[PDB]
Amino acid sequence: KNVETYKIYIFKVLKQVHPDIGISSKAMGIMNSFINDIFEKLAQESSKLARYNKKPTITSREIQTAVRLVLPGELAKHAVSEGTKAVTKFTSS
Amino acid sequence: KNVETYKIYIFKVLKQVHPDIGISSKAMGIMNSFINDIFEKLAQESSKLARYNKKPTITSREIQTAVRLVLPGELAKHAVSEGTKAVTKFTSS
Amino acid sequence: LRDNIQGITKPAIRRLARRGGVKRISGLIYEETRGVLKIFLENVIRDAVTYTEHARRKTVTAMDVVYALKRQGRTLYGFG
Amino acid sequence: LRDNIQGITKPAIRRLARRGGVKRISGLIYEETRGVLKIFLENVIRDAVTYTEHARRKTVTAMDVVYALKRQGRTLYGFG
Amino acid sequence: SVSKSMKAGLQFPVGRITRFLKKGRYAQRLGGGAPVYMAAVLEYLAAEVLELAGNAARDNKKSRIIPRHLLLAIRNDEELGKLLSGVTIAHGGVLPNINSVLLP
Amino acid sequence: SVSKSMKAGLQFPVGRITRFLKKGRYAQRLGGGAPVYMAAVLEYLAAEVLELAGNAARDNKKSRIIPRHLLLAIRNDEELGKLLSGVTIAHGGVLPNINSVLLP
Amino acid sequence: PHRFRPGTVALREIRKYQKSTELLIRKLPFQRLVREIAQDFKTDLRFQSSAVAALQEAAEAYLVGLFEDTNLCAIHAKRVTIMPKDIQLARRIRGE
Amino acid sequence: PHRFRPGTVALREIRKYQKSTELLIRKLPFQRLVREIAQDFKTDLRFQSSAVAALQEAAEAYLVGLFEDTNLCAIHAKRVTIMPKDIQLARRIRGE
DNA sequence: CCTTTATTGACTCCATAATTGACCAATTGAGCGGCTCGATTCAACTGTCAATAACTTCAAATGAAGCAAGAGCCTTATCGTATTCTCCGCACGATGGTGCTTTAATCCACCGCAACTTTCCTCTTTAATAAAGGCACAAGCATTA
DNA sequence: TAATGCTTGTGCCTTTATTAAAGAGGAAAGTTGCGGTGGATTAAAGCACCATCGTGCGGAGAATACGATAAGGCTCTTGCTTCATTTGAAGTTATTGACAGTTGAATCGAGCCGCTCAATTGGTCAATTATGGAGTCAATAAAGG
Q1: How far apart are the CA of B65 and the nearest CA of chain D, in angstroms?
Q2: Most buried residue among G52, G69, G80, H41 by CB atoms closer than 10 A?
């Protein structure tokens, strides 16, 4: 079987941020675990938010509220800004 | 409209444990909250168990393993015994 | 509203300490205990307000506070 | 396979204390540090075994240990 | 019409538990015996807590269970205390204890 | 075809995130912009952690990121440290610190 | 006239307040504090009364637990008087 | 001949072991201990190598954190030598 | 031990409000049937876990000696405690106003389902170079004088 | 300070193995179109939150005498650190074999989905009894003698 990871995307992000720095296999696995953990946390928080308001759907507002509730402070502010930028770019295209 | 609470059932249980003892409204609410919290914990554990093995079904085995993982020690043992007894009686009827 | 943290008076902090089994209390404690309390509220109310902002409401309900407490591992029974 | 708890030698406990920044170590500590360690393992391995019993397996995998650690608020990265 | 709670000999609402499990979307499909097992576990836990609370109420010369008795029952039991270590009981107070050093 | 990731200007797999969200059964329906928002948040967090890790690696005159550098980056940042306070990173070690009392 | 040795009334208060279940902080000052804190997150917020009651219950429970840990820390250092450093140590070990 | 003062080599070891990332407990004794503990829950259990590695990583991280809290508790009581009562206090405040 | 004084548990009474019981409705759980999935069992492949042996050599055990730190004791001074007096704002009871929260009806818009396409990602393989090992070596720190 | 022992920081060769790079395929993402449910909008009314006032009374604030607790200083003795020697047990490498995890099929059990009924429970009103406020007494504990 074939396993699914974020290895290529993490490598792309790293090469975009630090062009001249590579990453080891163990560090890439740790980064993949971190991404998976954050994804699960955000998804569970969004599911709880949808359940509380009796809404059968998860929209960008649910994800934004989950980001505010999970990520702390300036990290949450920047994450919300990036998410809003990406959603606007996706809609306008 | 209609608030879904275990208020009768817990009361019934009380009348089979302490026939001459009543329960107050605040204690009624606390017991209802406790039952709801335990139900949510067991259900989430069973959902994670089903997800881990890629099983789309929650059976009595999933609930039994969730009980083992959540309830501690003799509480878990007695709860497992009661659940097995109830499932056997339900199947035999 | 302003300066309502002082509304948590020294007798109230003393009573809270006595309920916790404290026999002697230093003079400085009443100050520190206030600040700590404030921090706790800042961690809960914020979360509660977040829920209130997600439901598009302007009234903070008991359910928002209960969910905010549960998010921090501070489950509260009796308001469910 | 008995009393394997003594395999956690005094130098190993000393090194673990040094990583934690401990300068001086009492003589009795090496005993107590063992017991609590055992307790920790008893809390994790059990849960891991539970997962192994649910999957109808007889081999304890690393994913089961990761899940067992996650249940106790001890998330581990690098084995996921 | 034999209710699913009477079939298993439970006082708890197996039908309502099934409806809650289905509405919670915990899994795509729900087994026949899962709600029965959950109802049995919940009934056992409620019976244990109520038994301890009634014992606490009787020890206090009372015939009505109040949040104080629930708190005493929870905090005086090892396994229930472990289960609900991080739970606050409203109007329950605290377990009466004093450190031996503080006593005269 | 034009990929959704490319349309949103993201390096993360919006399609794969949509598949994961739908397979996880977090809700009955999934919005159009929810996977895009999640991918953007994940990309931002990964970029922040990787930037701090690269700074730590360059500090030690290394050209490769190892778990030690990830640990140093996470524990030296206030927001990342708060987010991952309860997380153990394998082969990462600990932050080098000594209490001022112990020093000679 | 009659005077009680220091600590006797303290022990009596410890016994009395551990037996009761009532709230120890006055309701109106706590409500004002909660409103003042919340005004920094969203302007013109109305608070349901049960919400303020739940906040007071949670805050009092948290402070009582923190004072229990502080008393343990103070007794550890061969003292009976709790000090701000005891609270700081208790909050550090708790992970706050 | 040269003799270092007590605590100099201790500080050197603290500096050395805080910068390294290697495991400090020997692998084989820890594996035997894990197998002995697991034999009480289920008989004839097989362990993956990565499972034992993860258990060792988690146990070492937990012990290092516990020793950090113990050192804080010991320094609080105006000492530099950690004692079993320091570990007991740290575990009590942590909720264990 | 004695003796006085403050505190609290207990007893009883009067009120009281809070839990229990009864009744209408309303809504949801049980029943029946059809239908498509899934989880159970069997078997074969092979991945790898456990056991084995041997060699090495490095870290653990033990002891001696040294030394500094933890604990017990003493003193003091200062600062939290118990009590009293004054005052002040919390809380209970009544009221008015209004805004905002929940419910209902309408409409549209947006996402799930299904099929086809196509192209992007993931094992398998090859290579190449950053760093661990090894060696040699300079430099700052600790130690006794 | 100062020489000196020492552990650690630093420069360079080797190799290597751990990562950088390429290819086939095949699995998953993008596109198209339709339907039907869910979200957004607006009205409405009732329910609850905020602001106001009276008051009066218990709790908070401030002073005061003080005693006992916390902190600093001293000693001593003993428990723990540092170093040296011996060893014995962990680490590494190569090997065997058998147990068990995984994948593939068939299939029969089993749970999902629709529609109907009515039996169970939830909202509302009345009430009585366990409980709270209040007054009074005896038992208990503490503090000075």
Answers
A1: 7
A2: G69
Strand-pair partners of D65:
none
> Does residue E93 form part of some domain?
no
What's CA E47's distance to the chain center, in Å? 7
CA distance E80 to E71: 10
If we measure between CA atoms, which residue out of H32, E59, E46, E102 comes closest to residue G82? Answer: E102
Q: Is C77 helix (H, G, I), strand (E, B) or coil?
A: strand
Measured in whole angstroms, the distance separating CA E39 from the mean position of its chain's CA atoms is: 12
Q: C1' nearest to CA of F6: which nucleotide?
A: J30
Task: Provide the 3-class DSSP secondary structure of residue A61.
Answer: helix
Resolution for this experimental structure (Å): 2.8
Domain span including residue G66: 8-93
Subunits with 3+ C-beta pairs closer than 8 A to B = C, D, E
Nearest to G87 by CA among H86, H93, H92: H93
Nearest to C68 by CA among C58, A55, C53, H84: C53
CATH fourth-level superfamily of C10-71: Histone, subunit A (1.10.20.10)
Region D4-71: CATH code: 1.10.20.10
Is B26 in contact with E66 (Cβ distance < 8 A)?
A: yes
Q: In this structure, what token pair is assigned to residue C28? A: 């400085």
> Cα–Cα–Cα angle for D35, D40, D43, nearest 5°?
125
Chain A interface includes C54 (CB < 8 A): yes
Residues contacting D35, CB < 8 A, separation 6+ = none
DSSP β-ladder status, H46-47 and D59-60: parallel
- Residues in contact with F66: Cβ distance below 8 Å, sequence separation at least 6, in sequence order: A24, A26, A27, F57, F91
Got the DSSP string for H35-93? HHHHTTTSSS-EE-HHHHHHHHHHHHHHHHHHHHHHHHHHHHTT-SEE-HHHHHHHHHH
What technique determined this structure? Answer: cryo-EM
Do chain C and chain H touch with ≥3 beta carbon pairs under 8 Å?
Answer: no
> The CATH number of the domain where F65 resides is what?
1.10.20.10
Residue with tokens 């804190």: G37
Distance CA E96, CA G16 (A): 10
- CB under 8 Å to H82, separation ≥6 — which residues? D17, D22, D24, D25, D26, D29, H67, H70, H71, H73, H74
CA angle C9, G12, E60 (to 5 degrees): 110
Residues G91, C36 contacting (CB under 8 angstroms): yes
Residue D41 and residue D5: Cα distance in Å, rounded?
11
- Give which of H41, E21, E11 is closest to B46, Cα–Cα: E21
CA separation (Å) from F45 to A25, A77, C47, E23, F80? 19, 12, 21, 34, 9
In order of A61, B45, B59, the CA distances from B64 in angstroms are 37, 10, 9
SS3 state of residue C19: helix
Structure token digits, residue F53: 């890790």
What is the C-alpha separation between A93 and E72, in angstroms, rounded? 62
> CA E30 to CA B58: how far, in whole Å?
5
